[PDB]
């Protein structure tokens, strides 16, 4: 039994330093912010503003000259200049207290550089996989973190880098420092821990900068996840329209009313009455038929794929329910 994963969005603010760089970024190209350029201009200018705002929402020290001037010192301000670092400082402190180990994912390898200095400044043992790490080295980092009685506590990874199907079930908590445009890259990052072999409840903390760009980024990726799940559940609707008729289906069509046909010594239902007609009788037919039509349409148009799908055992015709 594998326990379903808990996913919690941690909406976070920005330090005064972040606000400064956030304004500085918007001011550098404020005419693009106001949407004053022509519709012909490339996406490049807007995409650049987007990435710099993500760097600002992650940590100000991603920009050169941001961190206070020389001499450069690792300090407490490495934590108190970024809204996520403050939330992370206490979140990790509480994670280590309850005996939980944590994987931390990020989009940017320069941010894991900042987290490396934080881990030593706080005394945390850790591993790290960037995607610039070779095949054999990241194997040792996996096994080191997975070792029975391991010394490590935090695992630093970039969202895409691990590969596919790696096992980090020795950790129980996943911290997404920042999210991906592709919701499947992040879900693959959560499933590093939430997969067969995990015995404890997997909890995923997705850091989100509230009232900023990352809040609107969250909704665009949430829709993409929802739109994805809709394609997936209809993946068998392709076959159903394509599928030809069963031996079970053809048999049911022919047998429909076959007994009453064999019983009829005269004529079938409608023609039993007259067979010549009164416009009252024809207007009675159309009214009765329109009633049956509306019932049929409303009955089927509310169905989904799970009601119209034919299992493959349908064409595995064995015997008759009761004989004909």
């Amino acid at each position: 039994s594998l326990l379903p994963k808990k996913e919690i969005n941690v909406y976070i603010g920005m330090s005064e330093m972040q606000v400064k760089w956030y304004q500085k970024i918007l001011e550098k190209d404020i005419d693009a912010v106001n949407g004053a350029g022509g519709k012909r201009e490339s996406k490049t200018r807007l995409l650049n503003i987007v990435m710099q705002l993500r760097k600002c929402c992650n940590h100000p020290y991603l920009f050169e000259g941001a961190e206070p001037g020389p001499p450069y010192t690792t300090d407490e301000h490495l934590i108190y200049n970024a809204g996520k670092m403050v939330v992370l400082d206490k979140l990790l402190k509480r994670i280590q207290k309850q005996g939980s180990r944590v994987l931390i994912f990020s989009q940017m390898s320069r941010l894991l550089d900042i987290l490396e200095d934080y881990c030593v400044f706080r005394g945390y043992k850790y591993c790290r996989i960037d995607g610039s790490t070779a095949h054999e080295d990241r194997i040792a980092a996996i096994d080191e973190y997975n070792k029975p009685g391991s010394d490590k506590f935090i695992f630093l990874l970039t969202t895409r880098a691990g590969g596919l199907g790696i096992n980090l079930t020795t950790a129980d908590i996943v911290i997404l420092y920042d999210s991906d445009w592709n919701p499947q890259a992040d879900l693959q990052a959560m499933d590093r821990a939430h997969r067969i072999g995990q015995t404890k409840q997997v909890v995923v903390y997705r850091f989100v900068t509230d009232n900023a760009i990352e809040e609107k980024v969250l909704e665009r990726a949430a829709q993409k996840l929802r739109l994805d799940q809709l394609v997936i559940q209809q993946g068998r609707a392709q076959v159903a329209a394509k599928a030809a008729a069963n031996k079970d289906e053809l048999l049911s069509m022919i047998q429909h009313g076959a007994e009453k046909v064999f019983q009829t010594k005269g004529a079938f239902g409608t023609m039993a009455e007259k067979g010549s007609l009164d416009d009252d009788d024809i207007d009675a037919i159309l009214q009765a038929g329109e009633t049956r039509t509306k019932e049929l349409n409303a009955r089927y148009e509310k169905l989904g794929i799970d009601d119209l799908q034919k299992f493959t055992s349908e064409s595995a015709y064995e015997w008759n329910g009761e004989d004909f």
């Binding site: 020290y61 450069y72 690792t74 320069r110 550089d113 900042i114 490396e116 200095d117």
Partner: peptide, 5 residues
């Protein structure tokens, strides 16, 4: 020194 450099 520090990794963020």
């Amino acid at each position: 020194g520090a990794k963020r450099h």
